[PDB]
Amino acid sequence: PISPIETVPVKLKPGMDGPKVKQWPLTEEKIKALVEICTEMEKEGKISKIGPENPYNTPVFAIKKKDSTKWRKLVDFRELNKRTQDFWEVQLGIPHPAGLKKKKSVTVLDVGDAYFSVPLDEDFRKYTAFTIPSINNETPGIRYQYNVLPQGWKGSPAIFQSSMTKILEPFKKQNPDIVIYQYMDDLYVGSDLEIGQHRTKIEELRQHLLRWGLTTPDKKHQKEPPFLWMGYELHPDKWTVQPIVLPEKDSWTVNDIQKLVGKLNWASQIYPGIKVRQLSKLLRGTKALTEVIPLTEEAELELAENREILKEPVHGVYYDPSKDLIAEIQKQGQGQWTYQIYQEPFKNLKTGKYARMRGAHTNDVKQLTEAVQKITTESIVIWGKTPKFKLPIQKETWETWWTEYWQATWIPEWEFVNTPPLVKLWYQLEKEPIVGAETFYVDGAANRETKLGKAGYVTNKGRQKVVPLTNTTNQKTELQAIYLALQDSGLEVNIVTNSQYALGIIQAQPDKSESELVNQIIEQLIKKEKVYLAWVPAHKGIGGNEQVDKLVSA
Amino acid sequence: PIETVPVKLKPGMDGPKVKQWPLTEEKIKALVEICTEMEKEGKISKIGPENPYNTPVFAIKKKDSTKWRKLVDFRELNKRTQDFWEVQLGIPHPAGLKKKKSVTVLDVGDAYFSVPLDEDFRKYTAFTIPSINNETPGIRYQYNVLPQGWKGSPAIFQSSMTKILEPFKKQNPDIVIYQYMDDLYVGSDLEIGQHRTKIEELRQHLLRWGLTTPGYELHPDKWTVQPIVLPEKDSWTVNDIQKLVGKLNWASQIYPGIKVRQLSKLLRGTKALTEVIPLTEEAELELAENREILKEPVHGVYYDPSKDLIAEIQKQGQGQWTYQIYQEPFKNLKTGKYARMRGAHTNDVKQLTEAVQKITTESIVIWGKTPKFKLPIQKETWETWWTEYWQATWIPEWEFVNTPPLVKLWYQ
DNA sequence: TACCCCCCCTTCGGTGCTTTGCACCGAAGGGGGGG
Ligand SMILES: Cc1cn([C@@H]2C[C@@H](O)[C@H](COP(=O)(O)OP(=O)(O)OP(=O)(O)O)O2)c(=O)[nH]c1=O
Ligand SMILES: OC[C@H]1O[C@@](CO)(O[C@H]2O[C@H](CO)[C@@H](O)[C@H](O)[C@H]2O)[C@@H](O)[C@@H]1O
Numbered sequence A: 001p002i003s004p005i006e007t008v009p010v011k012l013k014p015g016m017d018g019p020k021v022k023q024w025p026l027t028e029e030k031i032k033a034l035v036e037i038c039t040e041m042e043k044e045g046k047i048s049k050i051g052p053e054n055p056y057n058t059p060v061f062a063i064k065k066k067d068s069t070k071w072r073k074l075v076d077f078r079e080l081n082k083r084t085q086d087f088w089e090v091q092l093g094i095p096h097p098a099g100l101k102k103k104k105s106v107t108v109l110d111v112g113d114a115y116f117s118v119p120l121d122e123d124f125r126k127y128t129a130f131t132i133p134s135i136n137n138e139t140p141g142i143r144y145q146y147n148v149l150p151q152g153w154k155g156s157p158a159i160f161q162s163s164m165t166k167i168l169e170p171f172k173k174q175n176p177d178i179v180i181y182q183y184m185d186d187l188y189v190g191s192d193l194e195i196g197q198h199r200t201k202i203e204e205l206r207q208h209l210l211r212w213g214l215t216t217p218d219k220k221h222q223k224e225p226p227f228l229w230m231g232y233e234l235h236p237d238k239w240t241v242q243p244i245v246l247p248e249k250d251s252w253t254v255n256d257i258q259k260l261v262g263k264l265n266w267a268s269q270i271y272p273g274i275k276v277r278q279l280s281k282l283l284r285g286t287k288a289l290t291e292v293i294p295l296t297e298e299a300e301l302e303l304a305e306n307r308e309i310l311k312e313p314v315h316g317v318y319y320d321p322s323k324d325l326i327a328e329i330q331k332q333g334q335g336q337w338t339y340q341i342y343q344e345p346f347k348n349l350k351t352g353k354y355a356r357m358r359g360a361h362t363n364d365v366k367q368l369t370e371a372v373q374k375i376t377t378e379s380i381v382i383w384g385k386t387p388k389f390k391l392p393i394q395k396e397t398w399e400t401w402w403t404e405y406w407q408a409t410w411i412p413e414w415e416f417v418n419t420p421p422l423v424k425l426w427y428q429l430e431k432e433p434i435v436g437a438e439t440f441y442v443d444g445a446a447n448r449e450t451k452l453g454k455a456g457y458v459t460n461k462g463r464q465k466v467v468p469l470t471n472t473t474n475q476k477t478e479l480q481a482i483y484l485a486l487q488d489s490g491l492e493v494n495i496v497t498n499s500q501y502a503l504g505i506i507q508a509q510p511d512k513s514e515s516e517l518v519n520q521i522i523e524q525l526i527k528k529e530k531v532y533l534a535w536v537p538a539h540k541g542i543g544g545n546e547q548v549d550k551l552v553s554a
Numbered sequence B: 001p002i003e004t005v006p007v008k009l010k011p012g013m014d015g016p017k018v019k020q021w022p023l024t025e026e027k028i029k030a031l032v033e034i035c036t037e038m039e040k041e042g043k044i045s046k047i048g049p050e051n052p053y054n055t056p057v058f059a060i061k062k063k064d065s066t067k068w069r070k071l072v073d074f075r076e077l078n079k080r081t082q083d084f085w086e087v088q089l090g091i092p093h094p095a096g097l098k099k100k101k102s103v104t105v106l107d108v109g110d111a112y113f114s115v116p117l118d119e120d121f122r123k124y125t126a127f128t129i130p131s132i133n134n135e136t137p138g139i140r141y142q143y144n145v146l147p148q149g150w151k152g153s154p155a156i157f158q159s160s161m162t163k164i165l166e167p168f169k170k171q172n173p174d175i176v177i178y179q180y181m182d183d184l185y186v187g188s189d190l191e192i193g194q195h196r197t198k199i200e201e202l203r204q205h206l207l208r209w210g211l212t213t214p215g216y217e218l219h220p221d222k223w224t225v226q227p228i229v230l231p232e233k234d235s236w237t238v239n240d241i242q243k244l245v246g247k248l249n250w251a252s253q254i255y256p257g258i259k260v261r262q263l264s265k266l267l268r269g270t271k272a273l274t275e276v277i278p279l280t281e282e283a284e285l286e287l288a289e290n291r292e293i294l295k296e297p298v299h300g301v302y303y304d305p306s307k308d309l310i311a312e313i314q315k316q317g318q319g320q321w322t323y324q325i326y327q328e329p330f331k332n333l334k335t336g337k338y339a340r341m342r343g344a345h346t347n348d349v350k351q352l353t354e355a356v357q358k359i360t361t362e363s364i365v366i367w368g369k370t371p372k373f374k375l376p377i378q379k380e381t382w383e384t385w386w387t388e389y390w391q392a393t394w395i396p397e398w399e400f401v402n403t404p405p406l407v408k409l410w411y412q
Numbered sequence C: 001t002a003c004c005c006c007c008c009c010t011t012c013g014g015t016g017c018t019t020t021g022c023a024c025c026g027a028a029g030g031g032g033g034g035g
């Protein structure tokens, strides 16, 4: 045979042999287009005949190339991949057009039979053994071994990406001012050279790739904008995603909403204000992917206004390293947030959203902090720097939060923007007891077996209450005891509890909770003007805690 | 052209497979420039994806360094080479290092590039350099010499190090020298002027053996512990005594002599929190005896070299931070408090990073170990900013906790 | 009835402290997207 470029040594997991599984009963309609190109591979040295000396076998099928009449060859290596050594992928992420700098001339080109242009390792070729079917079951079919990277192997992508870089390294060093975005076999080549000199250096690279046996077909070659790259439409000074089609189904299943959710998450990168909360509330706890489920009036409203955003076309701009990065966040309600990253006002680089519900109890300040951290990581990935933040939270509101919180928290260089709705703290626990306010000694208890319990309080003025509770836990009675003292007290109240569980939840100042009992406590805390929470150990003969501990245990 | 010491992982253990986290532009530019010159000098060489192992890498600037310094997160690799740098080529720890009036740290990491590395172990030193906006896939490398930040590196170089130090250890007999990874700790009871002079002598003593030094000044004798203190009030409210009894109840897990029976008697009623409560005779005496027990050292606390060190940190607000170092719960080996550090009153993450660095430095001087930290911070908040403020050549183990302050035990 | 990478949204099951209830997180399956 002939050796084109430098190979990569491959092994198996130690103490294991090759794949020995039988083929699929493939239909003869695909066998016609299969043996066609398969026989053409031997002439080019891509595939070779093997004798019965090779005791391996793996299934083979084929699917059509999307938006094309040509067919793609796939080989099922699932059993081979389970026994093949592990790699470390050199693909760390996906390039985004918002990180592209403006270039005077741009060229995009695809690599014909990419995987099939890289030689496999010599000693490993035997394990790619597979048989080819026929029109009838009489003829056996030639068995082959791969001389190149096959489509369907778990090691083909990583070896191709690394080998492509070693070929492009000499050219990148000879042409330092040329930007080459390498992603699998698609290459984005841009420069500030004149369009005349640009296409000369392009042909210099096409010859450089051809020097190592890499084809650059003209049909895949793109010389004029708008360039179709990574599912985007790259214009000389703007970019946008390729058009997005939303399903027009009258009756929606689970797979329909899932397709709709993913389409909206993809659109949220440039189309501002996409929300998927109410559409995602339909896919919770569902069993069958084919199950039909009706649309709520909330999700019906959400899908309507989301379609109006996709109605008018939007676009993004390119990155200017000389100007600062600005990120502005807006609150959308129900734990939903959106943001726009821009350098010039009203000219967005990209958009996005953060709507993850982290924890059982939280507030708007925590979720804004989590959104800033999501934007920071996203911005460092795309541009390598942290943007300047414009946050809908008062400077003194944030100061009060992070200084009083028991956990360390921080937000980078930011300024306040007066765009409602503003993020605020809905109540503030007093640091010292309140003079003249009634002091409620609360406690609760529940039986592990009976699930019944009591919750009550005793005050310094003689006030008292005990309430029987059904199908409750020890923690719920302690929260319930706090709910009672908030209900039966004035605008200012001192509360003494022994529950570490309840005190830890309330001191973090949440404004939302999965527990409906906690939401009612929050509702009461907002109504109050001064609340003081204190903790004491139980069974120590302390204050009214000993007296109320006796009441809730009888 | 030097013999390579063979290195093997712990029995039944695979190499490190840790993902590379995104890097800023200034750190990627610095790493590309550093890795380029390290390749033309043969210290590293590019590899491919057939290596299934990987270790994170980023860049730092030491305190007032202004020059970038490469740093690899070998924490995962060191846990898988623990058999090497502890049992085999371990280093005894000088108990007198913490007693010197001044200790200086020097970065001797550049000398490890002289000794080659075992060929069978270079497959575990793999690291990947990312690209901005994923313009280029990962460029992977491997170390051909002793890597900076690997715990097996100072153990191999120890034989070469003690020969370079032997002339100066004889010219100055009573000066203590300790080596922890890429750092060299040298302490003396000499005056500040004499101490800094002998450092330069050690710098020139290392220059003629082929090593540069791109110095931190410590004072271990100045370090003070933080004890549990009770307030001084001319009048006590119900809430004051309630917080006090709860604090003494929690403190009873450390000092068993704490009693609360005479302070709980003052709370037997159902009184308002702001109501003033006069102290009885037995309560004043029970409080007086409790203040004395907190003056005593904890009974039966001593360091165990076979146990790991645990470090807890509490944010006290207004720039104050408290910490405790222990091996067993409630058997603290040291307690302390930091204040007015960099980033105070403006940046919580910078203060915590500075606190972790100061605590780890103290643990290396006193015991020669790095503790595992329980950080009062969320995972996503810490993993986003901690690299922007890290100024040390080592990285300790850490986990994240969320313990609300039900009782302010360590600071008033 | 193929492989590899990134993203969000949900479930579920393991973990440890708030404790045998409750809260958290990481793996996993659903989808979108890239080659
Ligand atoms: C879409 C797809 C891509 N690849 C990778 C990307 C490329 O490395 C190579 C196939 O690439 P090619 O066939 O060269 O790409 P192409 O489809 O544009 O075809 P061609 O230029 O001949 O007209 O495998 C798969 O293995 N499975 C897939 O489902
Ligand atoms: O492999 C983890 C190794 O590094 C640390 C801490 O940075 O853990 C890191 O890598 C882990 C990968 O699972 C994650 O915890 C995160 O990347 C990061 O914490 C060490 O604590 C650990 O030994």
Ligand SMILES: [Ca+2]
Pocket (backbone or CB within 6 Å): A110, A111, A112, A113, A114, A185
């Ligand atoms: Ca192609």
Ligand SMILES: [N+]
Pocket (backbone or CB within 6 Å): A445, A549, A553
């Ligand atoms: N109780």
